[PDB]
């Protein structure tokens, strides 16, 4: 957040979950980052740079996260036509 | 009557059988004198109890495995059951066929072998 100078304030800028577009607080212990491993996709062997996600507790606790994690990987890979 | 054994007996009885399994007999008097040497029990009457329960446990340990304490040879036979069972080496009998509506899935996923057909009657409980 900006000021007169454009100087940035706020002690931490919180992170905003992928499929809910809302922000998770300092205490919120049902919110998970989930690391998918990429592969080279020529031999199907692990190669470094991961795809990382974040999900909030609200969609987790109702049981909607399973669709969100699927759709996120469906707009990328690995998922073709499921 | 009464005289149900306390936890102080049952705690140390298990321990003494685990670490001195070999020394045990199945006679009262021999199992007493062993407990006297491998440990000190500060009373005499207490000693006569802990021996008798150590004896009574050792009867059952020569059958199937006790669920309160472990010995070595049971963990041997555990491992022997849990690394191969004589029932199969084949997966599962190598060829198993399935009935239609499973065949339709396989048709649309490029598979077309090793099937049977039976079109079993309607319906649930009927």
């Amino acid at each position: 957040m900006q000021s007169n100078a454009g100087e940035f304030v706020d002690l931490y800028v919180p992170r905003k979950c992928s499929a809910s577009n809302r922000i998770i607080g300092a205490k919120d212990h049902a919110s998970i980052p989930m690391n998918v491993a990429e592969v080279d996709k020529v031999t199907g062997r692990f190669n470094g740079q991961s795809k990382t996600y974040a999900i909030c507790g609200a969609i987790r606790r109702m049981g909607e996260s399973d669709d969100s994690i699927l759709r996120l990987a469906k707009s990328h890979g690995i998922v073709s036509q499921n | 009557m009464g005289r149900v054994r306390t936890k102080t007996v049952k705690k140390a009885a298990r321990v003494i059988i685990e670490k001195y399994y070999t020394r045990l007999g199945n006679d009262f008097h021999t199992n007493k004198r062993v407990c006297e040497e491998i440990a000190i029990i500060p009373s005499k009457k207490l000693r006569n109890k802990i021996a008798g329960y150590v004896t009574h446990l050792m009867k059952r340990i020569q059958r199937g495995p006790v669920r309160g304490i472990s010995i070595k040879l049971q963990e041997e036979e555990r491992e022997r059951r849990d690394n191969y069972v004589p029932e199969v080496s084949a997966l599962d009998q190598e060829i198993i066929e399935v009935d239609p509506d499973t065949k339709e899935m396989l048709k649309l996923l490029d598979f077309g072998s090793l099937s049977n057909l039976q079109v079993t009657q309607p319906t649930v409980g009927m």
Binding site: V36 | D92, L109, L114
Partner: protein, 208 residues
Amino acid sequence: SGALDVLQMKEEDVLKFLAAGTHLGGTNLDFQMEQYIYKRKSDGIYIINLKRTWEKLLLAARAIVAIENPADVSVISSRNTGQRAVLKFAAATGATPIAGRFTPGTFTNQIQAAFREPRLLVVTDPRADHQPLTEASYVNLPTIALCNTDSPLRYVDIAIPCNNKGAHSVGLMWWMLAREVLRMRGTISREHPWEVMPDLYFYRDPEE
């Protein structure tokens, strides 16, 4: 799948799926399990798609790879069928098994001596191991498990459908799970027969 046919399901594995009856799934359904099913028979039994099973296997396994420590991907199962299977899993691949009764408080205590902080979980059957799932949402653990048609989804991030009512469906699936993580991380890769088989991930099954 992703890569064109060097990750896609082979003709071989199809036989194993059908021989272990994984395709079959129970009578009762949930509204989160509607898409995974294709259809019903003429009888009460609903036929899970095996293509849809296969895609979910991969990113599930790829997440088990993505951690840089294999000693803190804690697997859990408490059903008798799922005891022998998980024990070989976490013996072969570096992982931590928690076999039998969970003994609650082991993801939130500072006094218990079985206290652990893992990152992932891999659970068999939500409705036998509901306890670790509830405690996972107090300390930010990602979660994976094996769902059936009638198993509800709640405090799980990804499902891996299966028949799993106590069958060869169980042990086969845990074997396949351990096969994939080695194709990416390990040197077992070649994708042509591995020495270890699914004939010892199956149930103890009381002998003669």
